[PDB]
From Swiss-Prot:
It is a single-pass type II membrane protein. Disulfide-linked heterodimer with a non-glycosylated catalytic light subunit (SLC7A5, SLC7A6, SLC7A7, SLC7A8, SLC7A10 or SLC7A11). Interacts with TLCD3A/CT120. Interacts with ICAM1. Constitutively and specifically associates with beta-1 integrins (alpha-2/beta-1, alpha-3/beta-1, alpha-5/beta-1 and alpha-6/beta-1), but minimally with alpha-4/beta-1. Interacts with LAPTM4B; recruits SLC3A2 and SLC7A5/LAT1 to lysosomes to promote leucine uptake into these organelles and is required for mTORC1 activation. The keyword Hydrolase does not apply. Glycans are attached at N156, N172, N215, N297. This is Amino acid transporter heavy chain SLC3A2. Changing N156Q: Impairs both the stability and the trafficking of SLC3A2 to the plasma membrane. Changing N297Q: Impairs both the stability and the trafficking of SLC3A2 to the plasma membrane. One of its GO terms (cellular component) is lysosomal membrane. The modification Phosphoserine is found at S197, S199, S201, S318, S322.
Length: 421
């Protein structure tokens, strides 16, 4: 564009969902105060906002006994919330509060009708906005009668308070047509879904999903996630976790993860552990129900010390995503590659371009990159420098000849090249 975007905070990197304070922090400190103790960790992830809760009083399926202005005392006090907000802001981490009303029940929106419940949400937005929250999330919106109307209203209350706040909506739907109807009356909404979840599939299929979505939504700013709540490991085999991290951190828009995504936390790796809220594995003492079962490589502490870990990959990708202009706000052009491949470039003005090449298949593949329809200003050079691969054995920092590019099974590559030459 040759004129620099005034980006919102949520364009500048990943959002990180913490839906269970107890499970995330562990026994003894499943409260708002305890979360402050994890802000240095979250800061090391370079995440730009935390999506917290819900944390409000909610008697299961009891509209009268549900109050979105009151914190459930199990999670602490309003002062604790105030102090968390303040420490978070200090570390450049913004806070989004999830206000999904009947979050302890099965229908998040209650079965008894909507206006009294939607009024609860409305009154709560003004209250929490004055307390200084940077925004809100509401999930399961497919279950909200008149969702597009209520979302527009709630978005307008939020943006009316300040342009630097936002509303995120989550849905269980994987249907593009249903998803686009939700975004119809709602231009400024980030919406998470299962649209990409469906992809445990080929590179051509993932490519078509991504480009279908981008073309349907025009120039609006997207989110990229595999679900509105669930772990990546709910949907992807281990062999694909790295590839998807690379993809989500390089697609145009805001990536959204759930706590544990950065370590490949898998709810089914450990007996008895809610798919809902798996216990966050800080170290080998983090699962005391079966003492001895957690091994170092499943933990934050073990993964931090290993440059080869998922966590180390997540941190490097997050760093790139939050500092490089072509990743922050560059255009996206996908192009023709070989059979199991999905390849694209991110490019902003004359800033360093990024080429992403993703092999979704279980066979080694020649990339056979065919540009031809790329813009001239971003065309492919003969060689680009390898920034990283999801697998070992490459010389990072040295140039690869693009014509001879070959990928290992499931390997993702991140390459960069300058404007011109």
């Amino acid at each position: 564009g040759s004129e620099l975007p005034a980006q919102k905070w949520w364009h500048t990197g990943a959002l990180y969902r913490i839906g269970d304070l107890q499970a995330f922090q562990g026994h003894g400190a499943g409260n708002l105060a305890g979360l402050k103790g994890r802000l240095d960790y979250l800061s090391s992830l370079k995440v730009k906002g935390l999506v917290l809760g819900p944390i409000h009083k909610n008697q299961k399926d009891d509209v009268a006994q549900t109050d979105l202005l009151q914190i459930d005392p199990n999670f602490g006090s309003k002062e604790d919330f105030d102090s968390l907000l303040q420490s978070a802001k200090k570390k450049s981490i913004r806070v989004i509060l999830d206000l999904t009303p009947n979050y302890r029940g099965e229908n998040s929106w209650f079965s008894t009708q909507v206006d009294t419940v939607a009024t609860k949400v409305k009154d709560a937005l003004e209250f929490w906005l004055q307390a200084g929250v940077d925004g809100f999330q509401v999930r399961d919106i497919e279950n909200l009668k008149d969702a597009s109307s209520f979302l527009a209203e709630w978005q307008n209350i939020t943006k009316g308070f300040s342009e630097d706040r936002l509303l995120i909506a989550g849905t269980n739907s994987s249907d593009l047509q249903q998803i686009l109807s939700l975004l119809e009356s709602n231009k400024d909404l980030l919406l998470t879904s299962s649209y990409l979840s469906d992809s445990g599939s080929t590179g051509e299929h993932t490519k078509s999903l991504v480009t279908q979505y981008l073309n349907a939504t025009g120039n609006r700013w997207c989110s990229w996630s595999l679900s509105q709540a669930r772990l990546l490991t709910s949907f992807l085999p281990a062999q694909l976790l790295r590839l998807y991290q690379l993809m989500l951190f390089t697609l145009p828009g805001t990536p959204v993860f759930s706590y544990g995504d950065e370590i490949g936390l898998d709810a089914a790796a450990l007996p008895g552990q809610p798919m809902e809220a798996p216990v966050m594995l800080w170290d080998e003492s983090s699962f005391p129900d079966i003492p001895g079962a957690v091994s170092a490589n499943m933990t934050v502490k073990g993964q931090s010390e290993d440059p080869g870990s998922l966590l180390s990959l997540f941190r490097r990708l997050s760093d790139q995503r939050s500092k490089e202009r072509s990743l922050l706000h560059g255009d996206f052009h996908a192009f023709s590659a070989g059979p199991g491949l999905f390849s694209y470039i991110r490019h902003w003005d004359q800033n360093e371009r990024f080429l992403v090449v993703l092999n979704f298949g279980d066979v080694g593949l020649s990339a056979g990159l065919q540009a031809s329809d790329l813009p001239a200003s971003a065309s492919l050079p003969a060689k680009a420098d390898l920034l990283l691969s999801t697998q070992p054995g490459r010389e990072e920092g040295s140039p690869l000849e693009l014509e001879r590019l070959k990928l290992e099974p499931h390997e993702g590559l991140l390459l960069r090249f300058p404007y011109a030459a």
